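Standup notes
- HV: blocked on the assembly model, inputs below
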Amino acid sequence: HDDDSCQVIPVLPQVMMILIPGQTLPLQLFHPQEVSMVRNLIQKDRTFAVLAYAQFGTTAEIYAYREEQDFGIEIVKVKAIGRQRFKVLELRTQSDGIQQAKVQILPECVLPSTMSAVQLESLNKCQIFPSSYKWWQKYQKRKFHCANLTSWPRWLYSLYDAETLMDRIKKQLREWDENLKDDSLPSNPIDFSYRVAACLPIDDVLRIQLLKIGSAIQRLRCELDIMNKCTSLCCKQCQETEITTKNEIFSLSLCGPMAAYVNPHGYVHETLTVYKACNLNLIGRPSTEHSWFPGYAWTVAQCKICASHIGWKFTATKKDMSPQKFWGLTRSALLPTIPVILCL
Amino acid sequence: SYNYVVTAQKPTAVNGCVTGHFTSAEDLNLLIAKNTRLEIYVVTAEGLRPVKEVGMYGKIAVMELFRPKGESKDLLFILTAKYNACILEYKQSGESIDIITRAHGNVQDRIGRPSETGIIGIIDPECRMIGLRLYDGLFKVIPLDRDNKELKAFNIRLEELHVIDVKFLYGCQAPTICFVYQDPQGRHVKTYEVSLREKEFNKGPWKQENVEAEASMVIAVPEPFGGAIIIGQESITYHNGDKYLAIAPPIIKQSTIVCHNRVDPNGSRYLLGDMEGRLFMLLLEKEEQMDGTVTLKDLRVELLGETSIAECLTYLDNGVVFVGSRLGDSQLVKLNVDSNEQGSYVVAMETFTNLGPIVDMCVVDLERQGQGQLVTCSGAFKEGSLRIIRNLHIRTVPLYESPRKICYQEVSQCFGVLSSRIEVQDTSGGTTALRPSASTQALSSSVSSSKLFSSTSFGEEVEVHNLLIIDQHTFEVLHAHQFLQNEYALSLVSCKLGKDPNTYFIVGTAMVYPEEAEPKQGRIVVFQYSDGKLQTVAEKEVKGAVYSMVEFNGKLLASINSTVRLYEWTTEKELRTECNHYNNIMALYLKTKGDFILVGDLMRSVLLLAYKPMEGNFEEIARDFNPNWMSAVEILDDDNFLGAENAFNLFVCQKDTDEERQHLQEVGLFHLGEFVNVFCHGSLVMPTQGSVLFGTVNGMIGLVTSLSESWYNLLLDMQNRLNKVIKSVGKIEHSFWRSFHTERKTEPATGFIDGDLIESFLDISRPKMQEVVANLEATADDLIKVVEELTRIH
Amino acid sequence: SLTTCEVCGACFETRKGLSSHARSHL
Ligand SMILES: CCN1C[C@H](Oc2ccc3c(c2)CN([C@H]2CCC(=O)NC2=O)C3=O)CC[C@@H]1C
Ligand SMILES: [Zn+2]
Ligand SMILES: [Zn+2]
């Protein structure tokens, strides 16, 4: 039906992002080619293709549709969410310019418990777990008790157990944002993986590899690897300027560490709040207009080597505030590095 | 590729046992279930009389005897793992025995969430319906009143979505089920009435607001007293409307009760068994009142002795209890009257072989007769053992200790086995063991001393890993090297290395600590057993887990986490890195045929490498990533590779521009029905090509051999032809049985020929023998010759 | 005003410099 199936979906021509499933994209359609497209789309499935350049991408489902004729042109304003990754097969460019795409739906491998086949029948009843850290030593003794019947030990079976992985990820996430450790993140592995990938400070090529990973467990196991191996963040361009390091990430507000903020011109800036940054030159004089973190004053910050924008250096206006100097670094500019292969 | 799989040893583990009146209404039968094997006995005052044992095309999941209104004898209800339900009746014509299928049907529901606690089959006390809990949120009801040959059922909706265990209640006015669910608020007990008329649930007689939180067992007490018993971790509570009694026996706090069998039909004595082999006796003390009505006075728990880790239990008669066992041997125990010298009123009285679980094996021609026996690490905990299998005769060496990995050092005339002892942290600050094991009872004993790596409850269990050097003739535990603390051994191999002439014992380990999730340090160790003493011929502290090691052309190929490292043996007796290959998967499995290297990973992550000789480094040949749980893997030839995956499923992949040459395509699928733990090249005997033996969790031992393309085609026809004549035990189609089944998706089999079917042509009638060979022209007598060569393989 | 960067907000003294910054964003 849908998984591992070859469909054709139209392509928003002006697009490029690596759309991680579950992310949302705002959209403003001016040219009549794309306006007639979304018109057909919302009449039909309203799922279009976000080409992730190259031969991959993610289908995006329109969930908000608004035509607000303004400035004497039929502007259609839409919002979509990312559903399923895909590998392109054939791109056919229509006469209108709207490109159509034969598409192979990438896989989302749902997998049973590692102990589903070895679980002893008598032991099947004593499984449902009754609703600190000794709990996880006990969790591991119980769930993987039947591992003694196999040729591998319990602690290996835990390195592939979705529930154990998701907690290891969520604990490290807690060092960045001491905050909601519950509804904040999802409960299904398939969603929890795609959520972690969209709120990690990773570059587009790491996103793209997590997106190509088939099973949600392999995707978690890798997300855990990135959080353990790629602990130094560098300049994406000159690739020779360590900016910050994993232990300096915090979360100034309750919205995350690397939340997404909007400048007064609609540019979005996943900005990873860190405590200390290095090898950054400050461009201009501090300002507080449109300051995303009220009470701090922003100063543009670029690389000391290639002068490529990295973020801002936010300064405490008052004296009560703590911290007083932090730095905001846009995700676009960073690149994770291992101070060695990422595994799955 | 095209392969032939044949069973070389039926499963040996018992996974259920029922006492009733299947065969005639006048004799007590004991029926036993061993995965795909139903054994039918008669309980004689001496012991057991074998009657008939039959093979279903499924995995016996539910097995229950019942007798609905209008029946000379008891009938048997069988539900398999692929949801094949069937009702069986016994029917023998003087000398002609046949298990007739009175009812069949597939209770599978297209939509459903498979329940955690699994498939539960229950039958009304008055045999008025058959309740199934296959999925969460639902309760299939096969109505038993009147002939339901097709097993028509309705699925009643159940509000509680987390049922632990359910049983039909006795003394019911109307069909009542008592069940135990978990809520956000806890674990509770409730009852419903199954209105067949309205095909829905109706409120029941009683309900318990909150009952112990590890409550796992519901036992329906027969009509004399009536109600249900809720066995838990610490307590055992009885519930019946008004009445409620609850005890917390001291003795039961040490383990968890997992099986239960009613002793008297009355319901005053129940047998209980735990997970450490102890056998308890639940006595319900009755009250003989003047109005007739009987009141539970008290619940008494008494310890009777120790048996085999018992999967199921059943009282037969005259004090004989059958202990069906999955970790160790099954047995018949005589419960005596008087406490024996130690208190055990249990006295072992007959043991049956259980080769399961089979965690490792090796093939060895010890009698130097060009034949080949088979030693297996078998069992777990107290039931650890080495079984030696020759053409089939089985010599059991107990170990009272879990064997994990086995290899054979021919030079030394002994076996290397890696074994694990369970010890409890006690008051001295150390750990005492709890039974004398092979390690504790060896004759020589080394402990490690590396200092390489520097580093609570008084009942917490610890593991003690040690290498055993076992003599190939007496099977004595000669040496017992005990490894480091917080050290887990993983891999063991006996090979001569380098130019050195000594054969050695190479053991790869991995340092484990409760916090370190990923293993970040280990060590390869080299041993030598040549003067009754284990000598450590240097070590090599690696930075990870040595999951697998194989000798590689006088070298040593170790996997350390995601790295396939090649080592050489240096003149001064030390390992040295030649080359390194870092992977993106955890190198769990390491197989090698000459210069080809196979790498594997739990989630079917195959990966073929090759050590380019003059270059002195590995190059990748191909990969294939089809995620699913993989448990064992092996090389058939340079191109075809075999492994086992998820729900008892074999598979073979194969290598072939170049974007295509770096990928292995699947060329064989098969529901074996067993859980394969080790593949092992070799025969037990001495046309068809190859010989790969495998052992499983259920003690099943099996054979894979590769065919020629013609032979596959021919046997394939013979398969279908045979499926017409050979009748199934549940009316289960062979092709459904064998189709690759995963909870996720089920696909039809390929590349595999079921020899066990192909071999039954020798056992069918000479008339029917002609019905199958018809228009192949080939006569019956040609084909009898064919199979007969095929029998000459196991 | 004609010297502020739309993307990061940097206000240069000269337009001919804000153009050199404009490179740095791709
Ligand atoms: C001075 C004249 N000029 C002022 C404004 O120019 C801007 C253009 C872009 C950005 C900002 C101002 C502020 N800013 C960030 C900084 C960090 C933060 O905390 N919050 C933000 O919004 C931008 O990225 C609007 C247009 C007029 C002409
Ligand atoms: Zn730079
Ligand atoms: Zn800018």
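- HV (later): unblocked. Residues A 235, 237-238, 241, 303, 305-306, 308 surround zinc ion (ligand 2) (CB under 6 Å). Residues 712-791 of chain B form a domain with the DNA polymerase; domain 1 fold (CATH 1.10.150.910).
- Next: hand off to the docking folks.
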